[PDB]
Amino acid sequence: MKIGIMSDTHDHLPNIRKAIEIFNDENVETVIHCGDFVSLFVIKEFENLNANIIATYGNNDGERCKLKEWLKDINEENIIDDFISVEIDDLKFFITHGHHQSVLEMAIKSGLYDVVIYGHTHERVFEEVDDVLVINPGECCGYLTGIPTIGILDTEKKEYREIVL
Ligand code: NI
Ligand code: NI
Question: Per UniProt, where does Ni(2+) 1 bind?
Fold first, then answer.
């Protein structure tokens, strides 16, 4: 019962691969991606990912419908929207690319969710506010910070841990 969390891969192929290996060498039932993958060829790398995918559109992802298609061709279960609102392992998630701050801020403040995941900032953080678990996996690419990361959330114990690439 492990869920992989990643974001802002920014076409960095090598790190996208280290991320896909790490996720496989783990249980990881599903992988959430918020960031901008950005280019279509990034999705061909994902055909090698075991887990189903839940993605969100980044403000940099230009090929929106084409991206949804390729994602599904890789697996009809995979989904991608601007905001994903779902329940997994008896926990209620709100996923989005940090992209729109007002919405992100409201999702945490509302208390309608257990876990909230976002990216955009490329600034990994992992905090708690009003019993809401707020997670930002950080930048898989490592461009702004020089520290490439991803993360893995234990659904039953509610335990998280960053993973430096
Ligand atoms: Ni970005
Ligand atoms: Ni962004």
Answer: 8, 10, 36, 122
Q: Could you give the residue ranges of the DSSP H alpha helices within 29-156?
A: 41-45, 64-73, 101-110
Domain count, the chain: 1
Which pair of structure tokens corresponds to residue 40? 């279509």
12 is in an annotated binding site: no
Cα of 116 from ligand 1 centre, angstroms: 18
Q: What CATH number does residue 142 fall under?
A: 3.60.21.10
Kindly state the DSSP code that residue 85 receives in the 8-state scheme.
Answer: E
100 labeled part of a ligand binding site:
no
Compute the distance from residue 106 Cα to the ligand 2 centre, in Å.
Answer: 19
From which experimental method does this structure derive?
X-ray
Rounded to whole angstroms, how far apart are CA atoms 120 and 154?
23
Domain encompassing residue 77: 1-165
Structure tokens, 131: 């019993």
Q: Please tell me the distance between residue 82's alpha carbon and the centre of ligand 1 in angstroms.
A: 14
Contact 54, 78 (CB under 8 A): yes
121 CA → ligand 2 middle, Å: 7
Residues 99, 119: Cα–Cα separation, whole Å: 8
